[PDB]
Design a protein around this nucleic acid. Structure first.
Lengths: 31, 131, 168, 122, 200
RNA sequence: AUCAGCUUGUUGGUGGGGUGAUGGCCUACCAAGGCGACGACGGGUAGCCGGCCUGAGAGGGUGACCGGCCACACUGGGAC
RNA sequence: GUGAGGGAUGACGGCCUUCGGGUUGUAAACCUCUUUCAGCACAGACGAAGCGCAAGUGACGGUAUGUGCAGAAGAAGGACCGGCCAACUACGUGCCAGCAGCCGCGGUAAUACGUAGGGUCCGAGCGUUGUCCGGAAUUACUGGGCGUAAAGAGCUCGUAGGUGGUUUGUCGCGUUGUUCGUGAAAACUCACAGCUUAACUGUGGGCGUGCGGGCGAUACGGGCAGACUAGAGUACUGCAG
RNA sequence: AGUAACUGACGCUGAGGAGCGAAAGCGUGGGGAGCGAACAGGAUUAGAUACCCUGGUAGUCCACGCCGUAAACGGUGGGUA
RNA sequence: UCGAAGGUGGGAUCGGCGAUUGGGACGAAGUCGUAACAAGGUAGCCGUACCGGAAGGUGCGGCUGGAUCACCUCC
């Protein structure tokens, strides 16, 4: 299997983790 | 573990047939002997006999090949199996190879072929197909 | 008299430093309509030449189909590569019910009434191969009776027997 | 799967995507033109496609395509819209029926007249 | 409805003569129009469709009626091709034409539609009327002296009357012994092509 | 199940009452049961069927006319 | 039903052209024939072995229908023509105007746009939209898969469940045979009959794939009562890590 | 593995469920030589939040617990002939 | 006594709007950089942690779905 699919999935995962890091305190205070 | 002795018998026959063996041995039981009887009487196998084994008895089957080494059996399929079992009435008995094959049916009158069961007006469990 | 069926022309190409070199491939069927068929696959730089090579290849490789009057003896199912074609005999007057590749092969083979369906790999070459493989799985009743060493009436049903009678 | 797995879970068919949800089970709907304008298609093609913004009776705001050569649609014009997709335009699934209600049949049309609401010449 | 346009067009397009003795088809046996000479692409669908058009323009049957006939013929326990052919042949206008009482199928249909005939003692004016065994088709007494029947009754040397029909009276009575079989039909074209087309 | 617990006349008994009729149908007392992953309890949708359409068949969709059963008659209760 | 037969080195016009001519086209014009259906005139029902002890009684309806009269006389449109998928040329326009179910067509010479000739398919219809099934074996019971295409839980133990070696007897639960009752009619299918045919309607079978009762069978599955050791486990003696 | 002394089908799979489960990470208490995210300088570079060099804190180690993920791969579920 | 409707009360559950705010898809030609594919010029990817305008960098463990190994003298 091409590593292209792994690359797409990893970019999605990395962006989501970055978003989670950027809004940790906001999420904690809203929940 | 072993679940279907009948299917194991059929697969021993099929595997020996593909390998052009002249001989196939397996543990003996009444049902397997009756299936061997039907196969021999219908001319699919050469001959069968039952020796005795170390514990019980064995079944020995001679495979029939033509002069140019062409197999006398074209296929062997198990129809009714543990889990999903198949029963047919006397009127909707299956046809094998458009009638060119033989379907073995277990009726209360014993083991019969599809044509015998149709002629006698009986039904039962469809054990296997031979063609 | 021979009936020919050019079932597909394809333009294939190989790459070179200058560019693309296009050739032509033709899949043809050759038969007499009486029970003999053959399949050829020719390639050339020109379509008529490829057709000619396919025709001669199909003529060289012939194969007799076990007809019974106007149809095949018994249902079969043949598979070659990923193509799966199922064949089923039909009552007289039904006609050929098949797709383009199967229809070409069966009409060249002389089969008049048959139900045929393709169940995989719509590619024409492989469907033709699967149809030929299915037609090679048919057995005449005499051969079957010889195999099991039984009279022809014991093995075949009465339905097949008189169908041979009326045809003969 | 196994037969037992089948009797335990069964087979679930794929769900069907509903098309033209704004119609709400009707072959056609009547709307009023929120705005009539023009737009450019996808990249491979190029034109000035004529598109109307229609507010249907099913309370759905929908963008509809105007077939034919010339049209006489302006604001607050009652039209009858149907289903039909235009490949070039991204999110247009409806076309305005020519020759019904305010929208007029095209002019000087002599072939496929019934598809553009142009009467036979006398 | 009915087809009233030129007859030679259909013969030219289908590549065979359907009227039977027309000189225009022999003069130009190719399709009509500007492009009647262009070579055609070969397609099984085209051949099947042209066979069906031949059948339904020889007998003057429209498409819906032809489809009903095909369904009826398939439903019957014979074989589809000759069943369809026999159903087509059993029409009253076709019977009148094959009986030698009409030069062409169109005029046979016109005569039947005008009520010039009378089947089994009761007036029938229905070109699609189907004729059964031991049917007696008679010309009503008023129109026996008309010129069409006059020239029909004094030129009884044309196309032979098939076996399943027999003219017995000097007044040109028609008797139907049994519905025709495929052997005696004597029709152009191929029924198998129509059967193939209608199974698509 | 991105609805796991539900039930207290609720589960059973006895004596009464009630009904054309059996029955927690109602009632007094007594016992603590009853249902649920074989999906109870919730949420959504829906009149059911002979049939109809499609399909080679299995199956899928449907319940217009005609025919049978049910439910309702401005909304909600009630009896005569 | 809007007509039928005959009708030519194949009229005019249109359109294309290689400027020759070809196509519309037997089509037309003309010569005969027939009038279905409409129009006019005349007569005129069955449905009522009915109802009524009164003399009469049909809403439909003066309808259907039948007979005369006149004359081809009053009667054809829609979609499509790049491939799938029957059916191609010219002019106009030029990445526009537009088309399009998909592939995709518009860049001054488009068989894909617009219009005209021609053609094809249907025809009192022809197309468009909406919805369901088919094609789709694309939820695969019939009838699919999981190394790399989507798809084996990270690995075990184990609950409910599913499934189970050889053999004896018995039950007749499943299974199977037959018989009785039921499965309304209508519908469907087969045959016949009646409407001038058909649709439609009636009659008689089949179907109603099931369920309930009796009677028969015991190969297989299951239950019950046993037996065996080839599976499984224990024991003993060694062994490697 | 061998003997086969013993029981006499006691087998297989297993929804849910329970347990185990690299490394990183988290808690409490210890320990800390080397290595070393982060962080500092140096260099390279157009620019170097990198690659290379010099330092270097968590962590890596131990005890007791959490976590429950991996290219946890033979990308190949278990049993049998 | 029961009893519809009505009133009071505290909760369930389904939607709409919401100043502000997060990401997603698409958009010929804008800006910034070169991350991947040839050993892509530091092999790539998986889990995890930290850091950075951004692709990304680095540590620990894992996988190959990673390229090259010339000449090579005795037999």
């Amino acid at each position: 299997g091409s590593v292209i699919k792994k690359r797409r999935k990893r970019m999605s995962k990395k962006k989501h983790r970055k978003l989670l890091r950027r809004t940790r305190v906001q999420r904690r205070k809203l929940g | 573990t072993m679940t279907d002795p009948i299917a194991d018998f059929l697969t021993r026959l099929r595997n020996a047939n593909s390998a052009y063996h002249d001989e196939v041995t397996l543990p003996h039981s009444k049902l397997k002997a009756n299936i061997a009887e039907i196969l021999k009487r219908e001319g699919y196998i050469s001959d069968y006999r039952t020796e005795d084994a170390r514990v019980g008895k064995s079944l020995v089957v001679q495979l029939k090949y033509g002069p140019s080494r062409e197999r006398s059996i074209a296929g062997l399929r198990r129809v009714s199996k543990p889990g999903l079992r198949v029963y047919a009435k006397s009127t909707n008995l299956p046809r094998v190879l458009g009638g060119l094959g033989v379907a073995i049916i277990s009726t209360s009158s014993g083991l019969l072929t599809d044509r015998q069961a149709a002629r006698q007006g009986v039904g039962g469990e469809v054990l296997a197909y031979v063609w | 008299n021979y009936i020919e069926r050019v079932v597909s022309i394809n333009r294939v190409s190989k790459v070179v430093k200058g560019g693309r070199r296009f050739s032509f491939t033709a899949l043809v069927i050759v038969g007499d309509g009486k029970g003999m068929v053959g399949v050829g696959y020719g390639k050339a730089k020109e379509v008529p030449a490829a057709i000619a090579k396919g025709v001669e290849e199909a003529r060289k490789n012939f194969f007799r189909v076990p007809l019974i009057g106007s149809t095949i003896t018994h249902p079969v199912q043949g598979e070659a590569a990923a193509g799966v074609v199922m064949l089923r005999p039909a009552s007289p007057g039904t006609g050929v019910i098949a797709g383009g590749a199967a229809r070409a092969v069966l009409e060249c083979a002389g089969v008049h009434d048959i139900l045929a369906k393709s169940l995989g790999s719509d590619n024409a070459i492989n469907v033709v191969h699967a149809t030929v493989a299915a037609l090679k799985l048919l057995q005449r009743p005499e051969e079957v009776a010889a195999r099991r060493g039984l009279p022809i009436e014991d093995v075949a049903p009465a339905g097949m027997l008189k169908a041979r009678r009326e045809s003969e | 799967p196994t037969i037992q797995q089948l009797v335990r879970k069964g087979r679930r068919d794929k769900i069907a995507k509903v098309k033209t949800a704004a119609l709400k089970g009707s072959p056609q709907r009547r709307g009023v033109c929120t705005r009539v304008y023009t737009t450019t298609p996808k990249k491979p093609n190029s034109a000035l496609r004529k598109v109307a913004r229609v507010k249907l009776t099913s309370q759905v705001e929908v963008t509809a395509y105007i077939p034919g050569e010339g049209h006489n649609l302006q604001e607050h014009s009652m039209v009858l819209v149907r289903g039909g997709r235009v490949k070039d335009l991204p999110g247009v699934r409806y076309k305005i029926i020519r020759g019904s209600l305010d929208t007029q049949g095209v002019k000087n049309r002599k072939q496929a007249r019934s598809r553009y609401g142009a009467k036979k010449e006398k | 409805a009915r087809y009233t346009g030129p007859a030679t067009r259909k013969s030219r397009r289908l590549g065979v003569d359907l009227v039977g003795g027309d000189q225009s088809f022999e003069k130009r046996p190719y399709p009509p129009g500007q492009h009647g000479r262009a070579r055609i692409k070969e397609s099984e669908y085209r051949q099947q469709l042209q066979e069906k058009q031949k059948a339904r323009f020889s007998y003057g049957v429209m498409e819906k009626q032809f489809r009903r006939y095909y369904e009826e013929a398939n439903r019957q326990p014979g074989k589809t091709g000759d069943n369809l052919l026999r159903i087509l042949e059993s029409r009253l206008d076709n019977v009148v034409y094959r009986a030698g009482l009409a030069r062409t199928r169109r005029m046979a249909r016109q005569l039947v539609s005008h009520g010039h005939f009378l089947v089994n003692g009761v007036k029938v004016d229905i070109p699609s009327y189907r004729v059964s065994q031991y049917d007696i088709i008679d010309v009503k007494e008023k129109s026996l002296n008309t010129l069409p029947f006059q020239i029909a009754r004094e030129t009884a040397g044309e196309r032979p009357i098939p076996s399943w029909l027999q003219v017995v009276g000097e007044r040109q009575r028609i008797l139907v012994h049994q519905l025709p079989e495929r052997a005696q039909i004597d029709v152009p074209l191929t029924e198998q092509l129509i059967v193939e087309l209608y199974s698509k």
